[PDB]
Amino acid sequence: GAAAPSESIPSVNKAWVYSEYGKTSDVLKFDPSVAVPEIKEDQVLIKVVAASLNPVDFKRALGYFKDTDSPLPTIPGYDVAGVVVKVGSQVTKFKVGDEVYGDLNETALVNPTRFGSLAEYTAADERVLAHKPKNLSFIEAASLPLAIETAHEGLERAELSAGKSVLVLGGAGGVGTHIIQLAKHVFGASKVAATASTKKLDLLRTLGADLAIDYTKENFEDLPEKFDVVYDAVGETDKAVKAVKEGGKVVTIVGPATPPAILFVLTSKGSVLEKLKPYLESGKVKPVLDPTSPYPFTKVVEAFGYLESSRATGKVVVYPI
Ligand SMILES: NC(=O)c1ccc[n+]([C@@H]2O[C@H](COP(=O)([O-])OP(=O)(O)OC[C@H]3O[C@@H](n4cnc5c(N)ncnc54)[C@H](OP(=O)(O)O)[C@@H]3O)[C@@H](O)[C@H]2O)c1
Structure with a gap:
């Protein structure tokens, strides 16, 4: 060169x-x-x-x-x-x-x-x-x-590590498609759940989501299942904080963040x-x-x-x- x-x-x-x-x-x-x-x-x-x-x-x-x-x-x-x-x-x-x-x-x-x-x-x-x-x-x-x-940075900030569960709000976008893949294939999550609309659920599963949730048909925060990590890529920290386990972490990339969720910029x-x-x-x-x-x-x-x-x-x- x-x-x-x-x-x-x-x-x-x-x-x-x-x-x-x-x-x-x-x-x-x-x-x-x-x-x-x-x-x-x-x-x-x-x-x-x-x-x-x-x-x-x-x-x-x-x-x-x-x-x-x-x-x-x-x-x-x-x-x-x-x-x-x-x-x-x-x-x-x-x-x-x-x-x-x-x-x-x-x-x-x-x-x-x-x-x-x-x-x-x-x-x-x-x-x-x-x-x-x-x-x-x-x-x-x-x-x-x-x-x-x-x-990557959001998952690291949420302390994701092997065996933990994660919920991704906005699985089908530029960022969310990587949140899913990294969570499953890089951070070793045991369960990856993600939200998208009706026609996008198969893609979520293809990328590594174990549970694809149609936000146009149901409300993730009302499910009894709670997650170690919630990564909001859509701006709904009000609901995201309702889906995390006690002691778990919620991160968002769309502010403002409702505590205990945090907002960061990469x-x-x-x-x-x-x-x-x-x-x-x-x-x-x-x-x-x-x-x-x-x-x-x-x-x-x-x-x-x-x-x-x-x-x-x-x-x-x-x-x-
Ligand atoms: N803080 C930071 O460092 C940082 C860095 C990157 C991005 N961002 C922000 O993060 C957001 C996502 O960026 P991106 O590049 O991934 O955007 P994008 O590619 O435009 O996201 C599009 C996706 O959002 C989905 N979506 C929209 N509303 C939804 C909802 N209520 N629930 C579930 N999915 C929904 C759509 O799926 P449906 O068609 O199925 O709705 C679509 O597939 C943007 O607001 C961006 O500004 C912040």
Whole structure:
């Protein structure tokens, strides 16, 4: 992995951009000539192959965390998979040519980059990246980081460990599909229960849920069964706290959290992906793509519209970029 020739890396590229906060249908525009970010010394430049969308992209674009956001205009997109083309002088873990993936923003809600993954090139901290598993496509790899790390961190915060039971509220989304798989296949849960609507229950069982609960037909919190861990991915901590065992833990990713539930926001770390690599290589944990994926780079507004419907099954990915 010798340095690319310098003339070979462009200083402008195509990207999606918004210059004011609002709905993606209103503010998100294609710009054919946006600056390529200059890398810091602990960053790499990536030729983007694929990018995933996350709810945070549209919540950010609505201005929900303007006080700690980076300055507009913004090129959105947290999740990336692609090929390193340049490395900073302090980088030791990657070289030119490495295939990598990660969630660009260490702290999602505090100073996320101005130069996201919905662009031909992006700059990424070494610390957020991992080597792409050889058996995963770039679409599949891009689908993973933010969701799989959020799943992992929430389960660790809830102290899940072998033999325990877990209930997942929102099993069929980007995050929930990983909460199920990790709980069963990485944390050794004895029983995994999860909620979704009627047509999504077989998917939950396929991913590792022992009990798939149709929230449109029954109320999980009224079941006599109580769980060691409850992981809310839908914003119903009021009910989640009613489904936990005394001494158990409830975590949510959608606040506000009703004590004793806690809310957290993930910390993006390549080391988490690296820890998960064997499960990804063996297929014990699988990417989960929405049937509408991939969306071409021309169709980013449509991809966001679909995510914003709250009905995505696994991940919405944009490819080819
Ligand atoms: N705090 C953090 O660090 C963090 C990190 C990631 C995500 N988040 C937040 O967590 C939430 C989930 O993100 P995500 O990427 O997984 O979203 P997503 O992929 O858009 O979630 C879509 C899924 O939600 C399901 N769903 C909707 N309402 C439901 C309900 N009442 N019960 C059960 N399932 C329900 C839908 O299944 P049905 O069609 O069957 O309803 C759909 O499959 C978002 O609000 C996001 O902002 C927070």
